[PDB]
């Protein structure tokens, strides 16, 4: 049968790819960074405790100015915090209270949110009248929205639970490009610093690197063993890290096209919800289901510290653009800032 | 001097935002949100339609907001998603109750309903949420039992030795076979709830009273009991 021949060809191609990757791995990251001195005991403290949310916080996103941030809760609100003064700038009620994601535009002009309504709503913050109102209702996804990131004021990449990603032209409200190839619900999405590429981790234990312009999957990484919930690009853009239900963080390299290091501990058995690198990429903060966020040595895989204090499951994580602080939101409707 | 004015404006805006937030919380904490789950043939649509017709109210969610005895309610059915639910089911980890609907007259797909109930009950996040079990389509179950063409023991070998429980209500004009089948299905669903509940959450089975308002009353009573038990547990008295 033709299906058997196609499956055999796919297996042969996978074998060839694995053999090439094995031949390409002449050493390991641990075997090379063994001579560098470890980071000292990392101790962050809760500088601010942003409170005012009703239900569990599901996502957050820092601003480019590294002062304002936006968070989305499951009670149907979008609160924009002035992190320096703990004040609230905006609180946008949402048509659907089931919201899984939120984003901050690089210019700070708009915000985006989405969820079980399968719609990416975009709200204009700095309008003429000063009242935040929905500007575009991006529809076309047949699954829940899980992540959204602004390319610029007129473009946004959204990942959905219909196993497809998309690039939206906000002005026309239409899908410029569709990224298909995942066999499971896409859960995370991370833009490269150059914005020309992005990665997405789905519930099929695979992360695919996509091309924004051409709309094709350049590379696929299959080092995990469970659904991938988080993904974050390295500051260099040549690597990224992933979190998964199998209680492991894994660093993949784009040029080597294979996994470089794993960050797991015997006593850690809960899933990972959010990951984010430091400004220099030396630290890898990762939220967990055990209400704790662990700081990992991105070069030596030593757990440098722990950010304890959240009463419920940590769900979102984010490091400012200048690396000044890291903000963690969890399911007890509380946001915290650490440095 | 600009900084002082900017900070004063920020504080005033934050005060307005917090006032609106507390006004919204006063309503959010007084509203009960119920998540409707089931199968294609379970019959959630008729329940939603009856509850909307009895009390006037109300894409990817079949939202419905109504008011029953000056108590706010919110019934939503998650349609339009894919068959995989292990990720979006985590949103409803703070709902008041889960209204699980079963087709009692469909023996072929009864094990699928049992497996779905087991998965919902044993979920890590859905482990503190009580389930209101709705055993729909009782007239069809009675017709199937009385016909005799299809036997429950064909799909469930444990029905041969099953006996009607002592605490069974003898509805008027009820054949012993019909009530035996009803209570066998109810006990099959209750074993999963009692096997791992450990008092964190409860199950409230209810054979549908044909097409009557009694189902809405049962939902209201179950929600009231859940709220009472939640208050007792928060006070440390249960």
């Amino acid at each position, epitope marked *: 049968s033709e299906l058997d021949q196609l*499956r055999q060809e796919a297996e042969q191609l996978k074998n060839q790819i694995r053999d090439a990757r094995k031949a390409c791995a002449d050493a390991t990251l641990s075997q090379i960074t063994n001579n560098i001195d470890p980071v000292g005991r990392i101790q962050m403290r809760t500088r601010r405790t942003l409170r005012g949310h009703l239900a569990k916080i599901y996502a957050m996103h820092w601003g480019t100015d590294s002062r304002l941030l936006v968070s989305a809760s499951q009670d149907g609100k979008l609160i924009i915090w002035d992190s320096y003064t703990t004040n609230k700038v905006h609180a946008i009620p949402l048509r659907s209270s089931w919201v899984m994601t939120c984003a901050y535009a690089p210019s700070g002009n708009y915000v985006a949110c989405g969820g079980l309504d399968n719609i990416c709503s975009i709200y204009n913050l700095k309008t003429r009248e000063g009242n935040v109102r929905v500007s575009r209702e991006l529809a076309g996804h047949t699954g829940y929205l899980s992540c959204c990131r602004f390319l610029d004021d007129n473009q946004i990449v959204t990942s959905s639970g219909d196993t497809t990603c998309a690039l939206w032209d906000i002005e026309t409200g239409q899908q410029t490009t569709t990224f298909t190839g995942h*066999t499971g619900d896409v859960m995370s999405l991370s833009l490269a610093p150059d914005t020309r590429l992005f990665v997405s981790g789905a519930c*099929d*234990a*695979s992360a695919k690197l996509w091309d924004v312009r051409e709309g094709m999957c350049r590379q696929t990484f299959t080092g995990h063993e469970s659904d991938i919930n988080a993904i974050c690009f390295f500051p260099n853009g040549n690597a990224f890290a992933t979190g998964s*239900d199998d209680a492991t963080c894994r660093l993949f390299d784009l040029r080597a096209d294979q996994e470089l290091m794993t960050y797991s501990h015997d006593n850690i058995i809960c899933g990972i919800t959010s990951v984010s690198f430091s400004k220099s990429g030396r630290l890898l903060l990762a939220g967990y289901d055990d209400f704790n966020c662990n700081v990992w040595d991105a070069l030596k895989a030593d757990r440098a510290g722990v950010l304890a204090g959240h009463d419920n499951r940590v769900s979102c994580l984010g490091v400012t653009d200048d690396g000044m602080a890291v903000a963690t939101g969890s399911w007890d409707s509380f946001l915290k800032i650490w440095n | 001097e600009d900084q002082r004015n900017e900070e004063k404006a920020q504080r005033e805006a934050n005060k307005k935002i917090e006032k609106q937030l507390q006004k919204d919380k006063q309503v959010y904490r007084a509203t009960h949100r119920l998540l409707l789950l089931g199968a294609d043939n379970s019959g959630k649509s008729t329940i939603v339609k009856q509850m909307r017709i009895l009390h006037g109210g109300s894409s990817g969610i079949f939202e419905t907001k109504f008011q029953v005895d000056k108590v706010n309610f919110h019934m939503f059915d998650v349609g339009g998603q*894919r068959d995989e639910r292990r990720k979006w089911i985590q949103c409803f980890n703070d709902v008041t109750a889960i209204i699980f609907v079963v087709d009692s007259s469909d023996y072929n797909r009864l094990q*699928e309903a049992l*497996n779905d109930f087991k998965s919902i009950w044993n979920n890590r996040w859905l482990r503190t949420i009580s389930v209101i079990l709705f055993l729909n389509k009782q007239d069809l179950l009675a017709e199937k039992v009385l016909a005799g063409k299809s036997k429950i023991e064909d799909y469930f070998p444990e029905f041969a030795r099953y006996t009607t429980p002592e605490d069974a209500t003898p509805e008027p004009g009820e054949d012993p076979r019909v009530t035996r089948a009803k209570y066998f299905i109810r006990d099959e669903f209750l074993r999963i709830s009692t096997a791992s509940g450990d008092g964190r959450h409860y199950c409230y089975p209810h054979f549908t009273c044909a097409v009557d308002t009694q189902n809405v009353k049962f939902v209201f009573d179950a929600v009231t009991d859940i709220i009472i038990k939640e208050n007792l547990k928060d006070c440390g008295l249960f």
Partner: nanobody
Amino acid sequence: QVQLQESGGGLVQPGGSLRLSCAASGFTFSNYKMNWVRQAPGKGLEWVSDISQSGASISYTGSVKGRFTISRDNAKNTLYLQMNSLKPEDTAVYYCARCPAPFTRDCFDVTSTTYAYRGQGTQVTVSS
């Protein structure tokens, strides 16, 4: 990558016997609860059996209880399903499934039309 390969299916006369295997690779076997699923022609995917990580907890469907036996061996990373007293309606494609997350009692989306942690399946046919 997570990969499950099944074997053992084939022609079996009614009242015969069979044994299925599931060579699991790409993940630690002793951390996940395993499953067996089948798909009869013209019918949807139907759960058959499951087994705990250590093999202590085992459950089947009503139509296969007393005929099918599920077992696992964490040393060889394989899952077995011995099938006895086969009947013609058992003709189905049998898939070896895995729970999505480790250390988890409940199992979600095992019988979905598409599921990443599922094998290609082996056709089992029963006819005299």
